[PDB]
């Protein structure tokens with residue numbers, strides 16, 4: 001009963017005999033994710049097809065994702081069940097990451113129903129419980145948003161796609177005005193368009209800040225066409241930055257842009273969100289600060305009263321050891337990255 005190559009969309013998904021009955025799950029600026037029947041574990045799983053190697057940048061992102069996910073182990077973080085790839089370096093064209101199948105994502109859920117303050121609260125907790133574990137290893141997701149937040153029928157939640165993940169390092173965070181980035185625009189912290197590369201845990205807190213407002217209204221906050229517009233959507237709600245708040249902002253252009261913007265007063269949350277728990281609104285406020293230095297940490301957030309029903313310090317594991325990368329890897333020929341990916345996946349080879 002051979003066959004293999006079922007194709008999701010119009011691309012091959014060579015994962016059989018183990019898995020068959022493939023079904024496209026969705027996007028992935030990264031790779032393509034499908035669901036399939038695992039014949040040994042006799043259960044349906046999710047399997048992402050990554051096809052890098054022809055782009056050094058993709059190679060980097062794929063290697064980081066793999067290396068991190070292979071080393072992480074946490075309930076609110078998606079693990080890797082197996083990794084399929086060619087037994088020959090030369091013949092390896094893509095990598096197949098087999099992961100536990102989740103029913104939906106937070107984005108699909110927000111589009112289908114209005115969450116109760118109870119659901120909103122529980123998902124925030126979980127997101128933060130995973131965030132704590134991730135930050136403990138000094139890792140930054142940098143692309144937290146509704147789609148990267150998988151959820152099952154039992155309301156379980158686990159963080160997604162670490163393709164843009166990197167290690168903190170606030171030493172090389174300054175970058176200059178209007179220096180672009182890859183992460184999803186609607187969730188970019190304001191300092192991203194002003195003077196930051198997003199190399200500090202504060203970048204993750206803002207995103208979660210956006211996600212909370214989102215679960216509270218079933219709509220982005222902050223959309224933005226339109227880079228920069230994004231910067232203006234934020235100021236629209238936060239109001240014009242405080243003096244010393246800048247300021248903190250010595251970047252000629254950044255400081256002048258902000259200066260040329262018509263004064264705008266902050267919009268009370270309880271105003272843009274009438275009928276939402278005050279406890280939740282207070283946390284949000286502390287997550288969406290214009291200044292990254294004043295932004296609430298992942299730990300104080302979990303300790304915030306709105307999560308008091310879930311907060312439990314002896315049941316929110318932390319990373320055993322921090323992580324660090326090259327050291328050269330950023331500037332390295334994509335082929336040498338193919339070897340690292342071929343080595344990192346070695347242990348899953350039914351053979352070598």
Ligand SMILES: Nc1ncnc2c1c(I)cn2[C@@H]1O[C@H](CO)[C@@H](O)[C@H]1O
Nearest residue numbers: 026027028033046100101102105147
């Ligand atoms: N294990 C899983 N179960 C179900 N869906 C999954 C996963 C994984 I890994 C990713 N996705 C969905 O695919 C989208 C693109 O990354 C993500 O936004 C998400 O929609």
Ligand code: NA
Nearest residue numbers: 048160161162
């Ligand atoms: Na994923």
